[PDB]
Amino acid sequence: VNNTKAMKHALERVQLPWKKHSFQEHQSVTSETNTDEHIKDIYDDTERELAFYKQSLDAVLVARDELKRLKVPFKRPLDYFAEMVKSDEHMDKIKGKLI
Amino acid sequence: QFMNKQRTLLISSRGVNYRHRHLIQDLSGLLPHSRKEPKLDLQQLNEIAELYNCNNVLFFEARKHQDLYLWLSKPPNGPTIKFYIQNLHTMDELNFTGNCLKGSRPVLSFDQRFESSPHYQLIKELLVHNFGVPPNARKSKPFIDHVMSFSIVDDKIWVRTYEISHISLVEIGPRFVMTVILILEGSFGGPKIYENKQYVSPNVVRAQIKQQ
């Protein structure tokens, strides 16, 4: 029932020391604003997805600027073919295309 | 090498839905550091994680063939988060036209709200270890393909998965909503150091709807 002292100790035991190392270790970006404005109605679909979208895309531009500075290849090449999470037949059928 | 090393035990109880099974499969593809094991008291998950040498557990608990809970822990000393998962939509589904590399390392986007209270700050760190992909794990792939986002709306954690286009975004799935139920000191044991007073079980909710 909100033992803040123990959750504080749990965080310190368990967190990795990210400041002593490079952004590539974690690739995580925390937003500055609460993503709580951008939503006038918690129960409107298109409103909250837009906020989610915004928070994520802001995190991606930040992440690309940092991985560029670190010389870590970023964008998936159009001609790099590795196993994807969905098949190409699945993608083509979802778009109603001829395979 | 790198400082961030993670191996996550990915395991479920008996009784998971078809929809539940799909999410497990989605996370297994999205997390090359996960190790999917045969199905599973809950203290016995510390031994199983030591068998497969995992320092995290993602345990999906299904009840009544419809309610899905996620238990996230650090075996064998803890802590443990218990979440109630709702609004589940797997990457299977019609309106998700994003695709990404199986095993590429995602960007993680966190709401500023995660820095707002001690229980959110502990969850944030734990989600990074589990839903981030460690550099440069066995079965991981190069290039940055997609983002997994976490946002706090009506004190629930809303999770989305987006493919990075070129730069715009297109949703992959899966998609779901977690609400924190409790936090245990230990790993499926020890005292509760957090309880959500706003959480109510879906079995009570289903009953109060019958009562009309």
Numbering used by the authors:
A (entry chain A): 195 to 293
B (entry chain D): 26 to 65, 70 to 195, 210 to 255
From the manuscript:
Brx1 is a Brix domain protein that interacts with Ebp2. We determined the crystal structure of Brx1 (residues 26–255) in complex with Ebp2 (residues 195–293) at 2.3 Å resolution with de novo phasing. Brx1 adopts an α/β fold with pseudo 2-fold symmetry, similar to other Brix domain proteins. The structural core of Brx1 is composed of two curved β-sheets that form a half-open β-barrel sandwiching two α-helices (α1 and α3). The surface of the N-terminal sheet holds helix α2, whereas the surface of the C-terminal sheet makes an intermolecular interaction with helix α2′ of Ebp2. In addition, the Ebp2 sequences that flank helix α2′ wrap around the Brx1 structure, forming an extensive interface. In the cryo-EM map, the Brx1-Ebp2 complex perfectly fits into a density bound to domain I. Brx1 interacts with a flat surface formed by H13 and H21. The position of Brx1 would clash with H68 and H88 in domains IV and V in the fully assembled 60S. Thus, the Brx1-Ebp2 complex must be released from the current position for ribosome assembly to proceed.
